[PDB]
Design a protein around this ligand. Structure first.
Ligand SMILES: CC(=O)SCCNC(=O)CCNC(=O)[C@H](O)C(C)(C)COP(=O)(O)OP(=O)(O)OC[C@H]1O[C@@H](n2cnc3c(N)ncnc32)[C@H](O)[C@@H]1OP(=O)(O)O
Ligand SMILES: CC(=O)SCCNC(=O)CCNC(=O)[C@H](O)C(C)(C)COP(=O)(O)OP(=O)(O)OC[C@H]1O[C@@H](n2cnc3c(N)ncnc32)[C@H](O)[C@@H]1OP(=O)(O)O
Ligand SMILES: [Ca+2]
Ligand SMILES: [Ca+2]
Ligand SMILES: [Ca+2]
Lengths: 198, 198
């Protein structure tokens, strides 16, 4: 079984939208979800890949995939027993070919200022449920890491909520340092508007 | 006293460099500090202000300051006592004017994907020690917030380490939500290089 990691283009926004929604449901944050296709198309592609928000999609096929600062990551391995994907038809870029979008990673440049250089921050990493625990999720993280090297990015960072012990353990196994003694701070859209009123 | 918040340009790199170093010393992370003037100049200005890494400087004068997309935030207040700055001469953009760089805030676009829209992430906010607890630090945070509104950015976020009770309390008082149940994750430059091999 074969996989491909590629940059997302505007025609992928339906898939991104659906993946983000699935993530919100999984994380119990559906009430915060206001994203739309028009919204995503309106904001995801205002800069070059890797200059700002950037998305890799991971696609799977039983067949080999046929062939700017980027070439798609190809990889192949075995899976023990057959995948059962109820949402398969919702994740088909081209309805002819047996290529399914199984997950994504959404990231952007951050700036660890002690290094005086850009890093990458991973906002989202998500494998659809039928495709978890088969070695695909590590390919997504590895893709971001390898890309970072290719562009001389110094560091890759993200956060995780401590109820998500499975993701914590995944990250540990991937060789990530995990620092619990940080707190996430936020001025919401409403907090900002209130501050603006001064 | 009079204050001004403005965008940093390349000629400010010495001040930024020194402020970052002061922050590293304060945070007990000097061993991670590898930033140089050439490094900062090489990375801080490869994109338009607000498209990527962006820096505001806060400057203070006993005299009023000189009369697209950004205009400097001016403000005037009173200080209970005269300020004693031992490093004054290291933070003078011009030398003609009695204008001193007292702090900065370094931030960039993030992407809260449930909003399908950019936010701002504040990496660093720092007032030099002579200038703390006099109402200047809030002007820095307010500048980022007001700018976010002006550009229709949805959210402003950052993290804080839980030994830093003073900063935690500052943020709370500024109306920020503070979520302790998150952990910071990191693949270092060495972790990446290791992932790149094999
Ligand atoms: C909240 C935030 O800000 S960040 C986190 C965002 N949310 C998430 O990522 C969780 C969403 N739910 C999911 O299940 C995620 O899609 C995933 C990525 C964790 C799914 O798992 P995958 O990534 O496919 O795991 P993958 O198989 O690549 O794991 C790589 C290897 O690490 C190891 N590993 C995986 N999970 C674990 C675990 N829980 N404990 C220990 N080792 C593990 C295994 O050796 C695995 O190889 P395997 O295929 O033989 O199991
Ligand atoms: C994202 C990051 O970089 S996080 C970690 C680094 N950030 C830091 O803030 C730590 C660096 N060390 C410092 O001392 C910082 O320069 C600062 C920002 C805390 C300096 O303080 P300032 O920001 O100048 O404080 P400022 O005078 O603006 O305070 C504004 C209001 O906030 C509140 N406040 C300020 N400090 C505190 C405090 N220690 N406890 C409670 N409330 C406070 C008060 O209401 C204050 O008004 P008041 O003094 O009349 O009560
Ligand atoms: Ca996320
Ligand atoms: Ca910082
Ligand atoms: Ca924590």
């Amino acid at each position: 079984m074969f996989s491909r990691i590629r940059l997302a283009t505007p025609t992928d926004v339906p898939f991104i939208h659906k993946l983000i929604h699935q993530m919100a449901v999984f994380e119990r944050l559906t009430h915060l979800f206001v994203a739309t296709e028009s919204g995503l198309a309106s904001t995801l592609f205002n800069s070059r890949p890797f200059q700002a928000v950037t998305v890799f999609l991971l696609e799977i096929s039983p067949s080999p995939f046929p062939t700017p600062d980027f070439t798609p990551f190809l990889e192949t391995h075995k899976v023990d027993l057959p995948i059962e994907d109820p949402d398969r038809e919702k994740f088909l870029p081209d309805k002819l070919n047996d290529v399914v979008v199984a997950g994504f990673v959404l990231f952007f440049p951050n700036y660890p200022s002690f290094l005086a250089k850009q890093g990458f921050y991973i906002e989202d990493i998500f494998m659809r449920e039928p495709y978890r625990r088969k070695g695909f999720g590590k390919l997504l993280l590895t893709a971001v890491a390898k890309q970072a090297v290719k562009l001389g990015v110094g560091r890759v960072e993200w956060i995780v909520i401590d109820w998500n012990v499975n993701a914590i353990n995944f990250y540990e196994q991937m060789g990530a340092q995990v620092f619990k003694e940080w707190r996430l701070c936020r001025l919401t859209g409403d907090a900002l508007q209130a501050i603006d009123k001064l």
